[PDB]
Amino acid sequence: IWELKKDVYVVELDWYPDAPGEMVVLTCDTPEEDGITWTLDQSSEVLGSGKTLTIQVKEFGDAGQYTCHKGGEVLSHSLLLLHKKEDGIWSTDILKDQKEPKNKTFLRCEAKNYSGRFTCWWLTTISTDLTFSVKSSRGPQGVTCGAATLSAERVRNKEYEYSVECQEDSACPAAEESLPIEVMVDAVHKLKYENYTSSFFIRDIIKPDPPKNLQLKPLKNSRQVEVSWEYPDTWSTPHSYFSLTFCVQVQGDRVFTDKTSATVICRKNASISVRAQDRYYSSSWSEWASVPC
Amino acid sequence: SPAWTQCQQLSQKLCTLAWSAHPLNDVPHIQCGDGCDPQGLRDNSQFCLQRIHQGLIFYEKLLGSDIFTGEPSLLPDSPVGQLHASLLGLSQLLQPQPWQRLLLRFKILRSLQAFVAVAARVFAHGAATL
């Protein structure tokens, strides 16, 4: 047994058919010592008497909210959640495997710049008796996370997307990251406890926003165009320090440049698309920005 | 009086070679106090450049050690060879066991990629405004 938060405990249950579980000792959080009784959830049945209660936790039926009483008053509550493992594997029912980048991707994080601000997101099929708790640090309590919030609801499979915005308190955008950020998500469905962790460097989760203000300037030759764009508004400043690189594609042909302009040959009915990437570090390319011929 | 555009061009090439060498305890890093941000470079660009120089010397000695020259032998056309040469070039521009020790090479190459990216940003900003 271990404390998750005040009056909330986790019991690691190694489940297989024939028992035998964990022998758990609960202690009443009170200066009192006498006339203490114990109940479980929504039953009046006295499970035990005394400041302490010994429980054999073998299944979800032994989990729940234990309460201690004295003189017709509740003294404290102890909520027992289970972290179930079967065949040495912890349960991962609450979060859906995003199956991209690889398999066993439950959390996904992304940064639009080097500010120290980032977002993590996950998917669930659960709509009730659900709670998420997000914690983060570098290595060192530098990171503050907001509350996990429902950000989307996709239909047929009926999945709910949750997202959280985190921020590194003492970030140095111009320095070299030596220790990675850790993102920890606690997931509780009814009496079932689950965990999810992500370890990354901000530089690795960078995905800039698309190039903006994509314009075409027709040239002297028919079908020859001068394409221009600008850096996204959310990207790190100054742009002369935090440089981007671009990819220009005629869709319906390809050109890589560090400049915000290019000359290509347009077929009418075709589209010119532009995407951006950090010039110095191989992180993700942005979504395509597009303009018709 | 640093050679800003020469340094910019070479540092960018190091990003390409470092990546090419792998795509994707114990080293130096560019820290907060090193003054590698635009303001630090405006006030006194030497603080950041000495620190970039120190890191370049460290990585070149590591890339020339038996961690890289040992076993399994790198390919004769490896970008590590050019990376080693270009590290030397940039530091001179600023101031003219068995196995399966791959795990250590990759720990070094990954760390080097982060170092050369900060350096490239410094030279690109300096070449553009200083």
């Epitope: 710049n113 500010s115 600008e230 850096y231 320090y241 | 405004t129």
Partner: nanobody
Framework: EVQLVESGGGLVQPGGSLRLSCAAS????????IAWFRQAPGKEREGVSG????????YYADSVKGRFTISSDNAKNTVYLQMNSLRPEDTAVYYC??????????????????WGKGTLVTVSS
């Protein structure tokens, strides 16, 4: 030494046009991005526009998009804010602010390291 001095505030008729300026000292414009914030009486500080001085790339909040124009004269170390088709809801104290490095053009108010005293623009219906 670091100062941001706004100017151009005044009484404006709805549909009116006004130009604001921000004189920067003693840092160089090309090292930083400059943002304009607005504080309507009784309301929290809000972002308006931001500019990367070295690029000329400009951002505009949805409330001002299509009506305001941000520009900069690097030589004079000043930032300008052309405000067109002004309306009673555009009434506010306008603040010039320096963007902390690594943050975008639409960076929040806590991502600004230095502020100006602010100039008042009142659009009287």
């Amino acid at each position: 030494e670091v100062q941001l001095v706004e100017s151009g505030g005044g009484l404006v008729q709805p549909g009116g046009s006004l130009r604001l300026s921000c004189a920067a000292s003693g840092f160089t414009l090309d090292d930083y991005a400059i943002a304009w914030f607005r504080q309507a009486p009784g309301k929290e500080r809000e972002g308006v526009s931001g500019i990367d001085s070295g690029d000329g790339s400009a951002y505009y909040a949805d409330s001002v998009k299509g009506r305001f124009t941000i520009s900069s004269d690097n030589a004079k170390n000043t930032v300008y804010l052309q405000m067109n088709s002004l309306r009673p809801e555009d009434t506010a104290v306008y603040y010039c602010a320096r963007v902390r490095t690594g943050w975008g053009l639409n960076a929040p108010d806590y991502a600004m390291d230095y502020w100006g005293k602010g100039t008042l623009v009142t659009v009287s219906s």
